[PDB]
Amino acid sequence: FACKTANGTAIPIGGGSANVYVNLAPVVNVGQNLVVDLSTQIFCHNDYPETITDYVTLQRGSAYGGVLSNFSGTVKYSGSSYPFPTTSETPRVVYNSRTDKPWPVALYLTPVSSAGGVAIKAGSLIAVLILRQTNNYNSDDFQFVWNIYANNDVVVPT
Ligand SMILES: OC[C@H]1O[C@H](OCC#Cc2cccnc2)[C@@H](O)[C@@H](O)[C@@H]1O
Numbered sequence: 589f590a591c592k593t594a595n596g597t598a599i600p601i602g603g604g605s606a607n608v609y610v611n612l613a614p615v616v617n618v619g620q621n622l623v624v625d626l627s628t629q630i631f632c633h634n635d636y637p638e639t640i641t642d643y644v645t646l647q648r649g650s651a652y653g654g655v656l657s658n659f660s661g662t663v664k665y666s667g668s669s670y671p672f673p674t675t676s677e678t679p680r681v682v683y684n685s686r687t688d689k690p691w692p693v694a695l696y697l698t699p700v701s702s703a704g705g706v707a708i709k710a711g712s713l714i715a716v717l718i719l720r721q722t723n724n725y726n727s728d729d730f731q732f733v734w735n736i737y738a739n740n741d742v743v744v745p746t
Pocket residue numbers: 589590601602633634635636639640641642722723725728
């Protein structure tokens with residue numbers, strides 16, 4: 589089991605860390621959503637699907653910088669929605685193919701009433717999403733840590 593990003597970089601077998609840059613709507617009003625869909629960016633595969641089933645959860649989603657201070661939000665993981673920052677590890681998604689399949693995570697962020705001006709700065713860290721991988725074969729228990737960076741400023745109009 590390993591993951592890579594579109595562009596991109598890779599996290600090899602045994603887990604590790606990678607940095608991900610996301611394009612964000614430059615302008616978002618109170619009551620609107622920023623949608624950050626990582627499912628077009630992060631892809632994973634099972635290295636031995638005939639003998640092994642891989643289980644993948646979103647172990648934790650954490651907010652940083654302008655997202656932490658100026659947004660509230662939810663995370664959608666494989667069809668189910670959760671508070672973001674998360675309060676528990678999700679149910680598992682099965683990886684059972686050698687073909688790269690998306691990691692089905694998307695953030696829905698909405699400005700708090702105190703956001704105004706540049707709410708998210710370009711190049712800044714906005715979120716960490718931890719992928720936890722296990723299997724039905726051995727004791728492997730690995731973390732794939734995705735540091736999510738804003739590609740551009742996001743302005744909340746005043
Ligand atoms: O993707 C399947 C497995 O690939 C890697 O495992 C390598 C192996 C193997 C193997 C398969 C069949 C028999 N003996 C060993 C690890 O990422 C492991 O965690 C993962 O579950």
